Design a protein around this ligand. Sequence first.
Ligand SMILES: [Mg+2]
Ligand SMILES: [Zn+2]
Lengths: 104, 292, 152
Amino acid sequence: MNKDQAEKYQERSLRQKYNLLHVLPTLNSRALSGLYYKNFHNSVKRYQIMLPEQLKSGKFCSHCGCVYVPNGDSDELGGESMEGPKKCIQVNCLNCEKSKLFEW
Amino acid sequence: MLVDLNVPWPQNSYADKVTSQAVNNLIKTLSTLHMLGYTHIAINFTVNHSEKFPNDVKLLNPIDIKRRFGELMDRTGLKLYSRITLIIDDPSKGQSLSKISQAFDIVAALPISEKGLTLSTTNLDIDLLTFQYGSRLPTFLKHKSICSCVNRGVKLEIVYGYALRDVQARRQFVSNVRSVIRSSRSRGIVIGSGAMSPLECRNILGVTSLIKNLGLPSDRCSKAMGDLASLVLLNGRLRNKSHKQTIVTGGGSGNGDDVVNDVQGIDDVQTIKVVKRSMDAEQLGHASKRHK
Amino acid sequence: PFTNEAHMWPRVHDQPLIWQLLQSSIINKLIHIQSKENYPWELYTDFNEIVQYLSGAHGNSDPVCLFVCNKDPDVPLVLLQQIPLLCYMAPMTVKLVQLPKSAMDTFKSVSKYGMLLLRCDDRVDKKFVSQIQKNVDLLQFPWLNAIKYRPT
RNA sequence: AGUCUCCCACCAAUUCGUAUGCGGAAAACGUAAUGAGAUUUAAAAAUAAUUGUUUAAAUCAACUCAUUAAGGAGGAUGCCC
RNA sequence: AAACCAUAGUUAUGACGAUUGCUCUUUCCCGUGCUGGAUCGAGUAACCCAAUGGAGCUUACUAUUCUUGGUCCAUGGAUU
Ligand SMILES: [Mg+2]
Ligand SMILES: [Zn+2]
């Protein structure tokens, strides 16, 4: 395998994985969400390339693995509620009933 | 289903040019084999390992299955495969099997020494291990090596077509065949006929009688000629055509278009298979319910 | 991209001279009394009602204009996580605008937190939003493109 | 069959004086109840023995590791009664 | 200079003949059925072999190249 064609194959595979991690089932089906999340992370671990922390912070859920999304393609919302602080800022979802809170 | 994998080609070195009489005799012997009855025939091309191999690809295969054999097969009704036997005696540095294995289909060996035998059994990626039944055996063949090689792949080949050559050669042929059958535990045995003319060919029953007189049972002979021959053909076809047995470019819809069976359809200068669209997403999954 | 082009929202440099005049308007708003701030102009300054108004409670006025202080340190990364997707998914046309200079944290010092969305229908509001639609407009959905997540 | 382990002399004790889940003289030995784990791990892979494939990685099944000392008496719960 | 000792003992376990039993298939009979009886046949395999004795573990075996028991949130057909 040539290195120039291997790099391109790598970016193509990463693009395809992130694209499949999006549209209908990774949003709706929490099972497939977690599955494709695990697959993408096992694929990025094998290449040993660091991931951008800016997105790594608020990337996905930790209980099921759906994209944290509040309310050209009308889709499902990931996060149903996002309160103020009320003591401290938190975010909740629909797919499961757990919530993740961060401190200012 | 009968397979004959040791049809010799009238040429040993690339310096030779084959005349029309030899290819006509080969045509006659192929017609003879088709008359009485046969299913698969793979011609052999013997060459030595010591001399330099030509640095070409489109000149390494002097068989031309498409031009003459492709012209006769539509009238005959069978398929032909190209096989090469690497006769290796000493471990010289000339070794470029990555090209000959990919250009040919089946690659066999004919060792004369013990070191060459060991390296061909362990490291050399080959398909069949043939011994010189005309000459004497190199040394005393052991059991564990042959059994581990059979479990690992490569099997032994017995050439009953050589015993029809001379008078003194039959004794050495029998002395080698009995030792090979005793040391191989009668597991990885493939039988072939090394005849250069249709005059030394026999029927399946004659082969069965000769082999059962040699010492191998008849049911095992039929089993090895039916399934062990098809499997050793499939090995050499898939290791070359496909990847290391993970992805195959041949798609068998029914029971006739198989990687070893379908030979005129599958392209060879490349590995693509241009077929019209037959699988879309709107068709019913259940084949019993799917109707056109 | 998911957040890659979310870094590069505004592209014009005619902004500041009218921007601190917009802060002068902000003073005009905030100097009356608790009620007479929102008397002529609908201003909201609480993250709760910020997200509740965009949840879909009322759909009267299409043009909403939200303003955030960001692209600087000393700011809640955790809360700048999710506001652009929220303003996009909202059925209202919400023109999210991000303050271009970090020295304009007087906004942080005055209203509540550096967040403020307004219902742009008053005649001065659209008087200038018709001049800002000329200026900048950039808002997409990551599910559509998702081709530049973060390669290289 | 196999480059695996151990017994085939004793030692009121520098001699594994080891009452440690059970059986066993020992075993790099069999099995039982619970919890967890997957080069992101206690440890298996894509930078002592054995096996062609050589545990798992929807659920089950299989491997590894981490806990549960023997006998008698009192109270509570569940079953026939 | 011997301690020489195996209900195989030092790489020996040979040559065939006959009888019973098991698997499936071929048919008959009483009473559906019976570890039922009787012919017409095939098969009785594969892995492999001791060299002082015993135990544990792992690894090879059984596809017209003998067999047996159970399980399966495996699929295929039918009834409720
Ligand atoms: Mg032995
Ligand atoms: Zn969840």
